[PDB]
Amino acid sequence: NYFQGSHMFTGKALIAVKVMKPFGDWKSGDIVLVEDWKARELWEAGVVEIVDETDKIIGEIDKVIAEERESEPLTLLPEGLYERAEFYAYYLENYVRLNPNVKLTKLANLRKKLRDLKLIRFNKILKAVMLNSLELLSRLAPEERRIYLQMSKIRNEWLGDA
Amino acid sequence: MDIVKLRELLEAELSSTDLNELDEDFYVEFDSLIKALKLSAESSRERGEDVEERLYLAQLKIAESLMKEIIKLRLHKIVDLAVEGKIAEMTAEEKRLFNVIRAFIEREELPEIYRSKEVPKEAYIIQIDLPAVLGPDMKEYGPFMAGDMAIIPTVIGRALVEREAARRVRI
Numbered sequence: 001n002y003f004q005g006s007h008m009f010t011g012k013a014l015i016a017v018k019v020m021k022p023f024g025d026w027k028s029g030d031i032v033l034v035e036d037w038k039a040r041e042l043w044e045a046g047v048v049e050i051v052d053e054t055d056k057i058i059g060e061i062d063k064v065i066a067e068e069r070e071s072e073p074l075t076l077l078p079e080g081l082y083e084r085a086e087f088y089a090y091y092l093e094n095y096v097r098l099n100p101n102v103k104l105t106k107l108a109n110l111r112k113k114l115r116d117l118k119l120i121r122f123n124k125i126l127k128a129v130m131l132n133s134l135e136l137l138s139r140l141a142p143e144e145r146r147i148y149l150q151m152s153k154i155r156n157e158w159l160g161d162a
Numbered sequence: 163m164d165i166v167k168l169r170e171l172l173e174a175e176l177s178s179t180d181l182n183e184l185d186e187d188f189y190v191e192f193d194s195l196i197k198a199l200k201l202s203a204e205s206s207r208e209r210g211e212d213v214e215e216r217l218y219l220a221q222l223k224i225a226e227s228l229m230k231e232i233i234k235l236r237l238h239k240i241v242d243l244a245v246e247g248k249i250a251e252m253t254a255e256e257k258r259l260f261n262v263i264r265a266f267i268e269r270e271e272l273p274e275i276y277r278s279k280e281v282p283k284e285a286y287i288i289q290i291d292l293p294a295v296l297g298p299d300m301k302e303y304g305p306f307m308a309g310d311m312a313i314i315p316t317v318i319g320r321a322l323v324e325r326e327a328a329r330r331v332r333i
Binding site: 045137142149 | 165166169172173176177178179212213216217220221223224227228235
């Protein structure tokens with residue numbers, strides 16, 4: 001009956017997909033990079049198959065998480081880290097319902113790792129508000145930028161400090 | 163217009179507290195993309211392409227989603243502009259709405275869908291940071307940030323001009 005949309009991919013991340021059938025100019029068996037949303041749509045209709053980059057993604061977050069817990073400043077996130085993590089989470093998720101278990105454990109890790117990374121950076125944003133600044137924005141994902149801008153506006157109207 | 167452009171404008175709406183300046187036809191072009199995505203989708207369902215269709219539909223949902231997030235950020239920025247008495251460039255549709263918010267605030271009449279007290283106000287560019295000023299109507303104007311365009315009573319704007327803190331503009 002009712003289709004519960006869930007997380008929505010808008011094309012912020014590029015996903016490596018293996019072509020199964022003659023769609024467009026793509027031959028079969030060849031690997032192409034598509035926008036996350038186009039990756040989930042063509043996957044659902046057996047036109048392509050998802051190149052399992054969960055291996056590279058999990059370890060990618062771990063590296064960034066490691067960097068954050070080392071030197072005070074917030075770090076520049078690899079392009080699309082957040083969005084690309086979301087996709088493999090959707091991949092692992094809907095893989096248990098594949099079309100004719102070591103995975104369903106990784107799904108939990110990626111989720112724990114992504115959650116962890118957003119919190120460490122959030123906590124660092126909170127504290128940064130307590131010391132606006134252009135430089136910092138050039139280091140935050142657009143959604144975190146919004147948060148920092150909002151935090152500071154609330155803070156300055158309350159405290160009025162520097 | 164396409165989803166890539168809407169993705170860029172959303173990133174730009176999120177990255178500043180200021181109303182992102184958009185192409186005047188932003189809304190008109192959005193509607194086109196959607197009328198164009200709407201025809202392209204029927205023109206495939208009937209034509210039996212479950213795949214070509216699924217894609218035309220998924221793009222349309224992404225468009226409606228991107229738009230929803232963009233208009234939400236913008237309406238809140240517009241509300242703040244209307245309340246703080248500031249000015250900024252915004253599409254034609256937005257000025258209409260801005261005028262309704264503005265009407266509501268000075269207790270005018272929002273439609274369905276000396277010789278007089280009336281304090282005269284004009285538009286100005288504030289040159290320095292200024293704290294809230296009290297107009298003759300006892301309503302306070304500000305605070306303002308250097309670079310802001312504001313609509314304040316001429317009695318005050320005039321004082322600021324001769325004081326090198328503001329300059330008249332063309333709204």
